[PDB]
Design a protein around this ligand. Structure first.
Ligand SMILES: CC(C)(C)c1cc(C(=O)N2Cc3ccccc3C2)ccc1O
Length: 213
C-alpha cells in the first residue's frame, strides 16, 4: 500500500539550538567522549529496566538481556550504539530530546566560552548533544513496553523529526545511529573504539560487545 507513516516536525528549544551550533562550529579537544555519554545513558536506561524488572519480570517479555553493542560500519560511515534497557515513550523522546528547555544549557554555554572542558557536558544535564561533536546526522530509534516504536532524527539546523518507526523491530531499548563526519572516521576503527571505551567507560556494569567487521 501507500504506507501512511506519521512524521511530526519540531523546533529545538531556542537555547538548545544555540548550544548545538556551539559544538558543531567550534574545535574541541577530547571529542572522544560523545561515546562515554551515549553509553552512560544506556547504562541508566538499563538500570531503570532492571529495577522495574525485580517486581514485574513480565517487563522482560519483549527484551531479556540487559547489554550494550557498538557497531562500527564502514559502508555507511556510521557508528551505532544499541541497548536493550527501558527506552522512551513519545513524551520521553519529545521532552528529553529537544522540544522543552533543559536547566543546565545556559550554565554550560558560559563554561565552554570561559574555557571549561567539553567533558562537563554530561555534568550539566546535556550529554546527548555531544553526539554532534563527531556526528553530522543522528538517529535515535527507541522502543518502550507501554508504547510503540519511534525514530528520532536531526542534522541540527534547529530541527528534529519524530516518525513512528517501522523498520528493524527491536524488542525494547534505544538505538543511536551516528552518521560521522568525513574527518571523524577514526571512530569507525576497531582499534580506536576498544581504546576509548577502555579508558573512558570501564565503570559500566553491562556487557559491551564490539560488532567488528
Ligand atoms: C539519546 C539518549 C536520551 C541520550 C539515550 C537514551 C536512552 C534511554 O533509553 N533512556 C531512557 C531512560 C529512562 C530512565 C533513565 C535513563 C534513560 C535513558 C539510551 C541511550 C541514549 O543514548
Amino acid at each position: 500500500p501507500m504506507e501512511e507513516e506519521e512524521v511530526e516536525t519540531f523546533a529545538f528549544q531556542a537555547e538548545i539550538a544555540q548550544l548545538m551550533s556551539l559544538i558543531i562550529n567550534t574545535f574541541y579537544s577530547n571529542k572522544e567522549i560523545f561515546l562515554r555519554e551515549l553509553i552512560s545513558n544506556s547504562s541508566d536506561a538499563l538500570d531503570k529496566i532492571r529495577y522495574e524488572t525485580l517486581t514485574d519480570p513480565s517487563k522482560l517479555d519483549s527484551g531479556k538481556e540487559l547489554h550494550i553493542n557498538l557497531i562500527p560500519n564502514k559502508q555507511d560511515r556510521t557508528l551505532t550504539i544499541v541497548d536493550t534497557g527501558i527506552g522512551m515513550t513519545k513524551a520521553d523522546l519529545i521532552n528529553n530530546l529537544g522540544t522543552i528547555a533543559k536547566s543546565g544549557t545556559k550554565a554550560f554555554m558560559e563554561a565552554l566560552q570561559a574555557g571549561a572542558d567539553i567533558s562537563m557536558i554530561g555534568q550539566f544535564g546535556v550529554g546527548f548533544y555531544s553526539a554532534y561533536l563527531v556526528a553530522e546526522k543522528v538517529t535515535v530509534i527507541t522502543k518502550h513496553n507501554d508504547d510503540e516504536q519511534y525514530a528520532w532524527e536531526s542534522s541540527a539546523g534547529g530541527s528534529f523529526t519524530v516518525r513512528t518507526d517501522t523498520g528493524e523491530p527491536m524488542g525494547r531499548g534505544t538505538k543511536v545511529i551516528l552518521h560521522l563526519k568525513e574527518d571523524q572516521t577514526e571512530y569507525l576503527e576497531e582499534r580506536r573504539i576498544k581504546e576509548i571505551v577502555k579508558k573512558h567507560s570501564q565503570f559500566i556494569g553491562y556487557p559491551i560487545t564490539l560488532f567488528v567487521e
